[PDB]
Symmetry: C7
């Protein structure tokens, strides 16, 4: 579903926020 896909996109962005902290 499109909503689930967007939520996974949100998670991916948050993983970027954590990896930026590298």
């Amino acid at each position: 579903g499109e909503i689930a896909k967007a939520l996974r996109e949100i998670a991916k962005a948050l993983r970027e926020c954590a990896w930026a902290h590298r």
Copy 2:
């Protein structure tokens, strides 16, 4: 749908927040 579209906008904003932190790490 517009809910999914708004959620994608949130993801986009969070990628900004990632970009800002990278600029923080380099500063």
Copy 3:
């Protein structure tokens, strides 16, 4: 719809958090 509008408000707030943090990075 009201939920979509609230979600966009969340996105706006997060753009406001990115802006504020860039200013921290520039203040440092």
Copy 4:
């Protein structure tokens, strides 16, 4: 609706997180 109200509360809290950074930006 209650869900939209809670989502707006989340946006408001995130504007607080921005505020916290701005106060820092003006200090630092």
Copy 5:
């Protein structure tokens, strides 16, 4: 509702993240 209650719990957690950021920044003086 349970979903709304959980979302409010998220808002509360974020207000805690704002408070913590403010104190961390002040702890670094």
Copy 6:
């Protein structure tokens, strides 16, 4: 509900993000 449980998990994770900077 499963969605409500995951949302509470998100809240719990955010409290960890707060404790990290308290730490």
Copy 7:
């Protein structure tokens, strides 16, 4: 459900964000 699974993925990402911030603070 797929939505609940995605939300749990978001929670997991935020737990990453706490681990990363904690190490930043200790570094």
